[PDB]
Design a protein around this ligand. Sequence first.
Ligand code: CA
Length: 1202
Amino acid sequence: AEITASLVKELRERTGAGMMDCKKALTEANGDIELAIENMRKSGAIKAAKKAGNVAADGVIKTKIDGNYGIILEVNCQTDFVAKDAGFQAFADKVLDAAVAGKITDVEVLKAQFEEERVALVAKIGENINIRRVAALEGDVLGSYQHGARIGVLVAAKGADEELVKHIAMHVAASKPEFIKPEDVSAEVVEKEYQVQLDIAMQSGKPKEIAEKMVEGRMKKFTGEVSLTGQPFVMEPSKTVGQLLKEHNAEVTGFIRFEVGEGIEKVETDFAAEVAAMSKQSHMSFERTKPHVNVGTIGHVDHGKTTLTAAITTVLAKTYGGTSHVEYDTPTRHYAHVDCPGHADYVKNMITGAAQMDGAILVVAATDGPMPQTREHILLGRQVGVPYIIVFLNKCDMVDDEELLELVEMEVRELLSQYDFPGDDTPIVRGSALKALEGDAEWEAKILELAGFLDSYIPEPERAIDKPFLLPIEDVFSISGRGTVVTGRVERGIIKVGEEVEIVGIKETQKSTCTGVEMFRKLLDEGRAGENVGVLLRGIKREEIERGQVLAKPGTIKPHTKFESEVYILSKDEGGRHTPFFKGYRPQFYFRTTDVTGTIELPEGVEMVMPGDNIKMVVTLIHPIAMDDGLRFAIREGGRTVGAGVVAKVLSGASSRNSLSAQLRRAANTRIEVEGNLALSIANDLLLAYGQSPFNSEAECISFSPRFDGTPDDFRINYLKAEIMSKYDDFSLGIDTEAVAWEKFLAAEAECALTNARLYRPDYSEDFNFSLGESCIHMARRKIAKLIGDVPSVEGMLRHCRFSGGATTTNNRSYGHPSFKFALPQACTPRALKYVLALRASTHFDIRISDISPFNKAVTVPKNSKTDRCIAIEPGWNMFFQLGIGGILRDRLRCWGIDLNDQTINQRRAHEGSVTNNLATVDLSAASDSISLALCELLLPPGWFEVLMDLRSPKGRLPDGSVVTYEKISSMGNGYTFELESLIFASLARSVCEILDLDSSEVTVYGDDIILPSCAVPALREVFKYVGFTTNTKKTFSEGPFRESCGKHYYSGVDVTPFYIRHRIVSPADLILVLNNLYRWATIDGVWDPRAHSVYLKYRKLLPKQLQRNTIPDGYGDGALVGSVLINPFAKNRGWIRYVPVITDHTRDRERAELGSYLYDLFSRCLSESNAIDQLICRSNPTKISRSTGKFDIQYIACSSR
Ligand SMILES: [Ca+2]
């Protein structure tokens, strides 16, 4: 058009307003400069008001103090990037200064004292930026802390110095206290939050004063914790601020803490769908070797990198074939695309690996041009090291002058070059995104053009197998007559047999040479990236290697101890630290395969790091590790991940006690001693503390049935009373034995006999008779068949067959580990021999079968006070295969909504059923011992039933020297018995459902633990009785207030699961267990029911003094009393991580079978092969044997206050 382009820039560069907002507002001033600028000025406020319908949840916080008068305001923008922009900073910095000098408490005074200049930005920037709440504080000495820009505190204290307020301001910034001291609590807010939590308690049935006292305790904590006084000082968590302050001469007159965006909602954003649903208007209108290049769009909020990411996808759809990331294809390569709406939030994903980048695409609108905050974009690109940036000029159809385009280009090509990107040489396409949606080929080509650059400018990423060999070492074995071998997964490159390789990492790098390469299955001549292999070496002993070093092509990789990195430490929500750390953080760093411990130094100016924020730190390790920049690592804390990070630049590199661990060790190994039955004594004092008659004799401990009425509280104790001593293996009182166990075993056998006979002969001589049982196995059979298959797939038999666990026909519990199963020859049954031959034909390693008998060992395990438990130890090659079908049955039962790895969903339905009364829970007595053969073949495909006959142990060898041939099909201890009873039970139960018009979906099962709708129970009972099973009338509940399933026991919805004292208590470990189980059964969140607390306290006095006070949080084990760890005198807080000591079972090392452990290692690589976001950088660890002595040890472990 008429208006010249050369002079709209002179106005553009004196305003900052858009390009078309200049070109058009200049045709109105007839082409007069100061005219058009004054036109825009007032024609501006409308823009602003046009903005304030956008949610502005970002922005910065500022703080200034004068002698002892301070103030704090937060001014909001809507983007992370603006918050740190040249201009925006200068604004909030003036609206802060001006607010100091002229003290301004009222927020409107200044909001309007600036409102004119506030538009002098919204116009330039184009984001809703509104100066939000301000307030101020003054006292005798008042200090301020500034956590970057996202959180500021103002602290005033009449009685302290500088260092102190700093610190207490630091604590306030990282603890969010609502009140300055516990008493400040709104007398009303608390008179009702207590008169409301006094119901929570009282409806559960608890007596008045117990609910009162409990609620009060809960209330004292509830308050104390949210009040500065009752908050553990964050730089000395072993003492509260209450005390920190009073021990210091001081007291705080008050505090103020603002965090950016508090209270504001900001409805979540989702890039994936948002584009897919924006092009939903325009949608209505062998080559796997292709590299995966990911890119990211970065630009102004409404310059429409949103609308562009659409066009790209649709246009590349009409022209070609196929963590919130949209993807699209080019004839040559496949692209992943992500939005970059937030500096910090990107830096986080690029570190956490949840999204890296090969090239960015900078999206600006030619309508406006580079926004002032565009340099922050480019700068984000610079900092993250994004190799290439392509620029898409958007909305060009709205610029009738072509010299204005070449002007914008100029502007952006220069910014690009202030930040070291190739400005003169960087590709820039001019095209509209919206028109390319409207099927307008003229502007459609401009999109294909852009992807045309993604194709040629963003370079193809080096394929993993083209980089120099490297295999992270997971384990070393010394193989007799073959030499040393390391196992790992080859991270990159290739290692051909005969090549020379270095082992560099934790010691003086050593060199060696590849003598071979093998997987469990075949043996190979080369190791190819991505493969889980074993690499054979020569002339290197097996103690000259450690898990943690790499094997690599010589000179490829070097050992380093010092490096400056960028890390993101996890937030609380993501399961990380819930507490900040400081100058001397001393965690462990996980490098592909091992923790190596190290010290960090913060950068220039930071002094605190909070769960959730980013950080550049220089880590310096204790001993070296093979690395170069780009290498990811986890930050670890006693096995828990609390951070992640990457190496940025490799630098040239340069507590506990004696008579404390020993003092506790001595106590641990003491023997707590008392008169009589300590367990029984405790139980009786617990009954007494709850107004219940104690046990008269040991005889009654186990002969006491509960009442299923009374309130939930009157029942919880009644139930505990009936269970707590019921499994105690140490009552003398009784002609009771394990002979009782066998009599049961012989009885199940005899019964299986009957049903094997019954189940083969139903021809009622007439046609009349039709029976429920008959009809159910007929239906069950058909459903199983459809679920299971004609026969077990080999594809499934292969990924589920394995060694694992306990004793076998040939290994005693002590040689239980899988390594001693590949080590020693396992037995095997005639029918089963073909399976192991089939296995032997598939591996080069030698599969050895020891004796070849049809026998298993029927043995005996303690279980009750009144009975033992019969079990079966299998030929260990049988087991290997019984765990195979057992594993496929496990996958298949998932289609019936049965998930056998999760007894959680069975506990909840027990809980539901006790309020709802619609689900019943049924328990079966002998179960694993009652599945007869007859029942098995009637129900199973013949193909299945055979491979079940093969893998089963048909005969049994008793301890009595004698023999049995099994009438049942299998016993607990058989690798598939659990799933086969699960499936047998589910199908039966489901068929009864169908027979009754109920949902098969309502039957859910875990072993012999059945939940189904309560109306199906009396039919189930009759069906079970038919197929053999004997139903426990005493333990199936289809009607009362009570249910039980998988260890959780419920009454009307309240958890009433008891605890058990199973063993005579003789050691401090033993006592602590009981005391802890009492703790858990009686605490409602760290708060004691006072009826038990008395008994706890009494018996706690029985332990060695130091041990009464050595406490751990919950979920950390039973090697210490569960309680407060900030109270724990022994807890040594090392390098900002708190270590507490616990009783360990003392164990001696043993020699592992190098071969069998190495097979086990490789057989596992094989298995995994046929199967936050930081678990991808951890492994599964080496084989170490040990035998536990009866002595105890003390181990220090990492803790956190919750
Ligand atoms: Ca049960």
